[PDB]
Amino acid sequence: IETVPVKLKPGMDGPKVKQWPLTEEKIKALVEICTEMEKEGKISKIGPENPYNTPVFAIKSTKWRKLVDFRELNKRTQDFWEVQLGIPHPAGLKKKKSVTVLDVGDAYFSVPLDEDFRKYTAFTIPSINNETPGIRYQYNVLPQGWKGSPAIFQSSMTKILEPFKKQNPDIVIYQYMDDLYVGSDLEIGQHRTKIEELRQHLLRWGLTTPDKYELHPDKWTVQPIVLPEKDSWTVNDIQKLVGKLNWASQIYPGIKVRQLSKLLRGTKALTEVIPLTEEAELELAENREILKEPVHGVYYDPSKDLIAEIQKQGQGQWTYQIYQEPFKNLKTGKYARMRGAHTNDVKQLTEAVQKITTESIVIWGKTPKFKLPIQKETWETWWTEYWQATWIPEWEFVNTPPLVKLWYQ
Amino acid sequence: SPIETVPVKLKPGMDGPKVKQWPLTEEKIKALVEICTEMEKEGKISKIGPENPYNTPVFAIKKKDSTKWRKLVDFRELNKRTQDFWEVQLGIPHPAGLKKKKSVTVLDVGDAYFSVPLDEDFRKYTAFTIPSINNETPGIRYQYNVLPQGWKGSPAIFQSSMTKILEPFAAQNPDIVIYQYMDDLYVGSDLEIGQHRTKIEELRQHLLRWGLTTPDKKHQKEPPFLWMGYELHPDKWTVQPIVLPEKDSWTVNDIQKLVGKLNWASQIYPGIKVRQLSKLLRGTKALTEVIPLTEEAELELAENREILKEPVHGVYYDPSKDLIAEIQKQGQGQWTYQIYQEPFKNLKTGKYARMRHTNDVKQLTEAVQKITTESIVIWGKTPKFKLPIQKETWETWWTEYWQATWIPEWEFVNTPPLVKLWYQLEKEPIVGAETFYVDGAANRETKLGKAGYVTNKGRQKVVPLTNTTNQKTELQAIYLALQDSGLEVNIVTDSQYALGIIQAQPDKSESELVNQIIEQLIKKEKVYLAWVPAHKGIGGNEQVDKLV
Ligand SMILES: N#Cc1ccc2c(Oc3ccc(F)cc3OCCn3ccc(=O)[nH]c3=O)cc(F)cc2c1
Ligand SMILES: [Mg+2]
């Protein structure tokens, strides 16, 4: 079929991003993969008259998978291709009991790409020690990772999905990039059999899915702030308590700490046990009660990007908050991971970022920009090691450490 | 040339350059004709009709005061209008990453750009005109058939042309390694000298078949090779001789050049320091301003002169052997490292320095990051690390550190100085320890301040301070509490600045006050620092605020 014409935003040139140095292993894997893809027509070699560039990486299984970082090209295309060929996002996907993610990227490789647009998909397999200038390719078909691909394949996807949709009107199906999110209220067994039914349906219609991941968004909510519960209280405990409540006053108006402040009126030792008075305990009760309820007047803005902050709690635990404006949390949570002689900090952080990004997709239909607690170069070095996703969120690296660490715990 | 041309566009919405041709002297026009007739004779240029509406300035310049002149064309106005190309090679291969070959040959091609044809439809945009004397006769029109010198596209196009030309020979000779770089090729092989020279002559003949000349005689360059500030020797690599000038006066320019040479030399000469000399360069003022050399800078420079006395060399890479990198601390926040496969031979060396309160372990980790990046770039792998730090030390650090860190495979090497945790704050308040409620305050205008404390034992103190800030008083309060307390002390501050600086647990800073605080913290047995909201009348904190 003839290709769908693809235009850029007026005034915007193509992407020109540097290629990250790679291990010899990864470079060889990419050379192999691209040799096969060139052999199948999916990509071709290009000349020096093509100035554009898009980074490439190698991730994983026991088989190497190639991952293109199309973020820049996305900002330079999809921003007008979320308008023109945009995909609507269902608000009922987050309400379902079970959501399974299917990989439907392999579809895009069947469909050709607009001839005048291919030059923007340019990527470079690097060489070690700048020995050779690098192997240069561009895509001839719809590339995985580009947001224009599922937008162009949208109608085909609708057409293939319509029969299954008709046979299953209570199942929600939402396509984000190369992934198909399928949610239902069915029992886990019935759910998995249904997902398999969709797998066989898609397969007998010419769509392979290399799954031969389960979420539960009905349990997902903005977690309530927890005040310490103690039998006896020392001066230090009451100080941390008053401090934390005072911090919480930035979110919940109505928080008072006077009755708790009068309890430490004299200059006492930090280990001195202080009994709670009437006004004090009543104040703590009222504060706990007002803290148990969710925040008032907090709504999602479709015109604003999502911001995800993460902080490390130690002992294999991380806590995160998703917001758009300060102290207006759209979605907080706490990602914990079992060590099992496996995990380190970067592994946990990466898996956390992926979990958060997936939740964000399921809820709002788009991904947040992360403020990551990690050195920039360290992350840029090792983030591809535990990356199992096909998309890549925006991120930046936080400078100053949080003193608010124990306030999210 | 039978070489296939590369299609070139002008930038969208732009047309060819129409620029004035300003008159020249008679001799210049004569020489221009003398050269252009010979260029036309070789088909590199061609006369054109009056139809061509574009033009480009032409100048004539003597070559090093010699017989033959040189034609110079300013394409800067055309370069603005031509499309962007693939970006040419940014960096160059580092000798430490090269591998020993029994034979290495340098082949430089002449007229490299003029030996490669230019896209036909684009040739009309490179049109230029030779002026006539007194404008009594029409000017001589010309245009390029090949890659013009100083044109935006010539380097990348020549690069790809060369690569495509080399592809067949490369295919028929998989056991020889060709490196491409600008006008040069560098051919290495493990073939015996006779076979190698045969293959070299074979390559020369190929390139000549594609219209590319290359040295006919015994190749003009022999080892050692002076290449990009390097000395490349058959079994070792080093840098070209560094010259540290002797001057009574030093400007910003001279210091910049000096720091340049020292940095450049630091890749193979172990121990080079540049912190004190570049600390003079903190002043972003004029490049001609004379900067007085401090005593520390003088000592540093002298030590560098001592290091650079006897020459040192680096070896080449062996894929079959392990890759080891070892790190040592130099004291002033400076770090140095050696990357090697063998005990007495370095592949290369280097340094790391933290610019812009910090601690030794964090710096060490940063260095490990730098070396990891460099290793990946040069050899395509990550090295095994040898580090002066205990496992319990580093584990203790990375466990309670707020950022996520990647700690690689490493073994402990007991070589002083060692990296350790000099002090460690208590996680819980100390029973049987005095509690200093501290506070400090200053005036933004007068810069008059005061810092003090109030303790649960009834002890109180207020010390006056001149020429200070709110922050520095907030630190001074804590310092005071540390000074007047026992080996175990509970400090309570309302300042999240001070709390932030201290909880980071630094062992060094560019602030003397913080250094004194660190000294006190090391001298103490147990120190618990707690924080409370200011002006909330919690009590204990209120009296100290009232005092100061
Ligand atoms: N001018 C110039 C020039 C000459 C040789 C170079 C070189 O050379 C090499 C070229 C191909 C190759 F396979 C391996 C090389 O170097 C391995 C190390 N080495 C080096 C020099 C020598 O005499 N012997 C030797 O063993 C690699 C390189 F990046 C740049 C070079 C630039
Ligand atoms: Mg105060």
Identify which of A70, A40, A206 has the alpha carbon closest to the alpha carbon of residue A149: A70
Is residue B49 domain-shared with residue B185, that is, in the same domain? no
- The 10 Å Cβ neighbour count of residue B166 is 18
The number of C-alpha atoms within 13 Å of B548 and in the hemisphere containing its C-beta is 28
CA of B241 to the centre of ligand 1 (A): 19
Which backbone phi and psi does B179 adopt, to 5 degrees?
-105, 135
Q: Between B89, B153, B430, which is nearest A130 by CB? A: B89
Chain A: closest CA distance from residue B438 (Å) = 11
**Closest residue CA from atom 26 of ligand 1:** B100
Q: What is the 8-class DSSP label of residue B419? A: B
B293, B317, B341 - which closes a domain:
B317
The number of the ligand nearest the C-alpha atom of B182 reads 1
Is residue B100 domain-shared with residue B119, that is, in the same domain? no
Chain B: closest CA distance from residue A258 (Å) = 8
Chain B: closest CA distance from residue A301 (Å) = 30
Identify which of A158, A215, A211, A221 has the alpha carbon closest to the alpha carbon of residue A191: A215
If one counts the domains in chain B, the total is 5
Exposure class string for B384-409: b at 16+ Cβ within 10 A, else e = ebbbbbeeebbeebbeebbbbbbbee
Query: How far apart, in whole angstroms, are the C-alpha atoms of residue A147 and residue A77?
Result: 8
Three-state secondary structure call for residue A52: coil
Which backbone phi and psi does B397 adopt, to 5 degrees?
-70, -55
Query: Burial level of A380, CB count in 10 A (0-12/13-18/19+)?
Result: middle
Largest CA distance in chain B: 106
β-strand pairing of B184-189 with B103-108: antiparallel
- The 10 Å Cβ neighbour count of residue B437 is 31
Query: How far apart, in whole angstroms, are the C-alpha atoms of residue B427 and residue A360?
Result: 35
Three-state secondary structure call for residue A29: helix
CA of A20 to the centre of ligand 1 (A): 25
Residues of chain A with CATH 3.10.10.10: 5-91+117-157
CA of B205 to the centre of ligand 1 (A): 21
Identify which of A247, A321, A231, A330 has the alpha carbon closest to the alpha carbon of residue A287: A247
- The 10 Å Cβ neighbour count of residue A303 is 5
Structure tokens at A337: 């991971």
Is residue B41 domain-shared with residue B97, that is, in the same domain? no
Residue numbers preceding breaks in chain B (C to N > 2.5 A)? 356
Is residue B356 domain-shared with residue B293, that is, in the same domain? no
Ligand 1, from B94, B98, B191, B240: best to mutate by most atoms within 8 Å of Cβ? Answer: B98
Identify which of A33, A41, A98 has the alpha carbon closest to the alpha carbon of residue A63: A33
Is residue B330 domain-shared with residue B292, that is, in the same domain? no
> Is residue A177 within 8 Å of A145, Cβ to Cβ?
yes
Is residue B442 domain-shared with residue B545, that is, in the same domain? yes
Comparing alpha-carbon positions, the chain A residue that sits nearest to B400 is: A314
Give the CATH class of A5-91+117-157.
Answer: alpha beta
B435/A268 Cβ within 8 A: yes
Query: How far apart, in whole angstroms, are the C-alpha atoms of residue B453 and residue B464?
Result: 12
Ligand 1, from B89, B94, B104: best to mutate by most atoms within 8 Å of Cβ? Answer: B104
H-type alpha helices, B312-452? 360-379, 391-400
Residue B297 sits in a domain of what CATH number? 3.30.70.270
Which backbone phi and psi does A214 adopt, to 5 degrees?
-120, 130
Which backbone phi and psi does B350 adopt, to 5 degrees?
-175, 180
Q: At what angle do helices B470-483 and B496-503 cross, to 10 degrees?
A: 60
H, E, C per residue of A272-320: CECCCCHHHHHHHHHHHHHHHCCCCCCCCCCCCCCEEEEEEEECCEEEE
Q: Which residues of A touch B493 (CB under 8 A)?
A: none
* Residues with a CB atom less than 6 Å from ligand 1: B 93, 98-101, 104, 106, 177, 179, 186, 188, 221, 223, 225, 227, 232, 234, 316
Element (H, E) at B108: strand B103-108
Residue B473 sits in a domain of what CATH number? 3.30.420.10
The number of C-alpha atoms within 13 Å of B220 and in the hemisphere containing its C-beta is 9
Query: Is B121 marked within a binding site?
Result: no
**Residue B95 belongs to domain spanning:** 89-113+155-223
Query: How far apart, in whole angstroms, are the C-alpha atoms of residue A264 and residue B294?
Result: 54
Ligand 1, from B107, B109, B232: best to mutate by most atoms within 8 Å of Cβ? Answer: B232
Query: How far apart, in whole angstroms, are the C-alpha atoms of residue B394 and residue A194?
Result: 50
Which backbone phi and psi does B201 adopt, to 5 degrees?
-65, -35
Who contacts B319 (Cβ-Cβ below 8 Å, separation ≥6)?
A: B99
The residues with which A333 forms a beta bridge, in sequence order, are A320
Query: Is A179 marked within a binding site?
Result: yes
Is residue B329 domain-shared with residue B417, that is, in the same domain? yes
CA distances from B101 to A356, B195, B490 (A): 51, 14, 67
Chain A: closest CA distance from residue B206 (Å) = 20
- The 10 Å Cβ neighbour count of residue B49 is 6
Query: Is B108 marked within a binding site?
Result: yes
Three-state secondary structure call for residue B275: helix
> Is residue B46 within 8 Å of B39, Cβ to Cβ?
no
β-strand pairing of A214-215 with A179-184: unpaired
Task: Return contacts of B34-42, CB within 8 angstroms, 24+ apart.
Answer: B34/B69, B35/B69, B35/B71, B36/B71, B36/B130, B36/B140, B36/B142, B39/B114, B40/B142, B42/B114
B404/A373 Cβ within 8 A: yes
> Is residue B296 within 8 Å of B276, Cβ to Cβ?
yes
> Is residue A232 within 8 Å of B508, Cβ to Cβ?
no
Pick the CATH number of A215-300 from 3.30.70.270, 1.10.540.10, 3.30.230.10, 2.130.10.10: 3.30.70.270
Exposure class string for A15-46: b at 16+ Cβ within 10 A, else e = bebebbbbbeebbebbeebbeebeeeebbeeb
CATH level 3 topology of A92-116+158-214: Alpha-Beta Plaits (3.30.70)
Is residue B258 domain-shared with residue B395, that is, in the same domain? no
> Is residue A174 within 8 Å of A181, Cβ to Cβ?
yes
Q: How many CB pairs under 8 A join A and B?
A: 180
Query: How far apart, in whole angstroms, are the C-alpha atoms of residue A291 and residue A287?
Result: 6
Who contacts A291 (Cβ-Cβ below 8 Å, separation ≥6)?
A: A224, A225, A227, A248, A252, A255
Three-state secondary structure call for residue B495: coil
CA distances from B40 to B33, B36, B44, B143 (A): 10, 6, 6, 10
Q: Which residues of B touch A130 (CB under 8 A)?
A: 89-93
β-strand pairing of B384-387 with B410-412: parallel
Which backbone phi and psi does B484 adopt, to 5 degrees?
-100, 20
With the CA atoms of B183, B187, B193 and B199 taken in that order, what torsion angle do they form, in degrees rounded to the nearest 10? Answer: -90
B374, B403, B422 - which closes a domain:
B422
H-type alpha helices, A59-137? 71-75
Is residue B18 domain-shared with residue B150, that is, in the same domain? yes
Query: How far apart, in whole angstroms, are the C-alpha atoms of residue B478 and residue B469?
Result: 15
Query: How far apart, in whole angstroms, are the C-alpha atoms of residue A311 and residue A380?
Result: 19
Whether the link from the prior residue into B224 is cis, omega within 30° of 0, is: yes
Query: How far apart, in whole angstroms, are the C-alpha atoms of residue B482 and residue B78?
Result: 70
H, E, C per residue of B36-83: HHHHHHCCCEECCCCCCCCECCEEEEECCCCCCEEEEECCHHHHCCEC
Residues of chain A with CATH 3.30.70.270: 92-116+158-214, 215-300, 301-409
State how far Cα A47 lies from the chain centre: 35
**Closest residue CA from atom 10 of ligand 1:** B188
With the CA atoms of B298, B304, B310 and B316 taken in that order, what torsion angle do they form, in degrees rounded to the nearest 10? Answer: -170
Three-state secondary structure call for residue A406: helix
Query: How far apart, in whole angstroms, are the C-alpha atoms of residue B34 and residue A354?
Result: 69
β-strand pairing of B69-73 with B184-189: unpaired
> Is residue A265 within 8 Å of B539, Cβ to Cβ?
yes
Q: Which amino acid is at B350?
A: G
Structure tokens at A87: 């995909």
Q: Which residues of A touch B537 (CB under 8 A)?
A: 258, 261-262
Identify which of A234, A263, A260 has the alpha carbon closest to the alpha carbon of residue A249: A260
> Is residue B482 within 8 Å of B434, Cβ to Cβ?
no
Q: Does domain A301-409 have CATH number 3.30.70.270?
A: yes
B291, B317, B343 - which closes a domain:
B317
Query: How far apart, in whole angstroms, are the C-alpha atoms of residue A194 and residue A183?
Result: 10
Exposure class string for B240-277: b at 16+ Cβ within 10 A, else e = eeeeeeeeeebebeebeebeebbebbbbbbbbbbbbbb
